[PDB]
Amino acid sequence: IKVFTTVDNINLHTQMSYGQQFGPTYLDGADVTKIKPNSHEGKTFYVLPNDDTLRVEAFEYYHTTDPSFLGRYMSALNHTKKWKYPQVNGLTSIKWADNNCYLATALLTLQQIELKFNPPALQDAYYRARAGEAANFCALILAYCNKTVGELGDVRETMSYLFQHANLDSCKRVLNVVCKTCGQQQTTLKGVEAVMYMGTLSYEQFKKGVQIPCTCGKQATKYLVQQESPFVMMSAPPAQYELKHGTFTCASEYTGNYQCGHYKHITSKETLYCIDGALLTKSSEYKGPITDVFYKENSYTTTI
Ligand SMILES: Cc1ccc(OCCN(C)C)cc1C(=O)N[C@H](C)c1cc(-c2cnn(CC(=O)N(C)C)c2)nc2ccccc12
Ligand SMILES: [Cl-]
Ligand SMILES: [Cl-]
Ligand SMILES: [Cl-]
Ligand SMILES: [Cl-]
Ligand SMILES: [Cl-]
Ligand SMILES: [Cl-]
Ligand SMILES: [Zn+2]
Ligand SMILES: [Zn+2]
Ligand SMILES: [Zn+2]
Ligand SMILES: [Zn+2]
Ligand SMILES: [Zn+2]
Ligand SMILES: [Zn+2]
Ligand SMILES: [Zn+2]
Ligand SMILES: [Zn+2]
Secondary structure, eight states, X not given: OOOEEESSSSSEEEOOOOTTTTSSEEETTEEOXXXXXXXXXXXXXXXXXXXXXXXHHHHHHHOOOOTTHHHHHHXXXXXXXXXXXXXXXXXXXXXXXXXXXXXXXXHHHHHTSOOOBSSHHHHHHHHHHHHTOOHHHHHHHHHHTTOOTTOOOOHHHHHHHXXXXXXXXXXXXXXXXXXXXXXXXXXXXXXXXXXXXXXXXXXXXXXXXXXXXXXXXXXXXXXXXXXXXXXXXXXXXXXXXXXXXXXXXXXXXXXXXXXXXXXXXXXXXXXXXXXXXXXXXXXXXXXXXXXXXXEEOXXXXXXX
């Protein structure tokens, strides 16, 4: 049966009654390697790279040479295609399934922050996600993050993985630490390290100064001097926090114990919204266990 095989669903290649024929083969998420070619006449078949043309084309689309990627990608795709993606306040979320709470919180965050992905696979799926088709994008996140369906995940970890696979070259951060004995030292962060900070949740507290230790046991302060990024992520261990409307963009809510809780998404619009997969809850002021707060920026210069 004359059929079409592909590695990226972009460049298509036109190739008896699948392992001996093509190797590991997939058709819409399902592993058909142990099947025989009927209704599968002319359909596009995902195959593993086995020639140089497909090996080089696989890097053009996925920017990876790991032979496990496609297998881990189609393995996650079998579940994500069965997931439901409701539109909650103009945003695509995921109904609870296979411990996808941290994935849904990451999907809502990405729809509200500016990010340009370097791999065309992530970028092309990023556009399809905002439109409503978030299956191919959720599976790709699991593949790039080396995570599997059902495994427990962390929002700060998953975002950090994606941030490295994205264009944050123009993102700079000029920090200044001063010591009561050593003196004043200036540091500059560029890329993924310039948009993230684990420690405090308040962007204003980062500007006013945060107490950190130097080589000397004496306490030093670290304050932000210059920031040049479309957004910043502020992270801290889960504690109680009051989120004021208009002072932030979106925030992540973790409830439970280490590697044992449940993630919830909070966003700021005309009023504070709380998304729990397919559920919605409004509030004027919010207070709860917040672990990550996202703030929007463009250019900031300190007064000190
Ligand atoms: C869900 C999940 C999946 C994977 C995951 O991987 C991380 C592994 N890396 C290193 C490969 C982590 C998490 C997770 O829990 N993250 C949340 C946000 C989190 C939660 C907590 C936290 C709550 N209560 N307590 C108390 C407690 O546990 N007692 C028994 C009293 C601790 N502390 C944290 C401290 C630091 C960072 C995150 C913390
Ligand atoms: Cl690369
Ligand atoms: Cl499922
Ligand atoms: Cl869950
Ligand atoms: Cl990349
Ligand atoms: Cl903001
Ligand atoms: Cl949970
Ligand atoms: Zn070709
Ligand atoms: Zn790349
Ligand atoms: Zn499932
Ligand atoms: Zn990678
Ligand atoms: Zn010193
Ligand atoms: Zn010092
Ligand atoms: Zn208000
Ligand atoms: Zn959960």
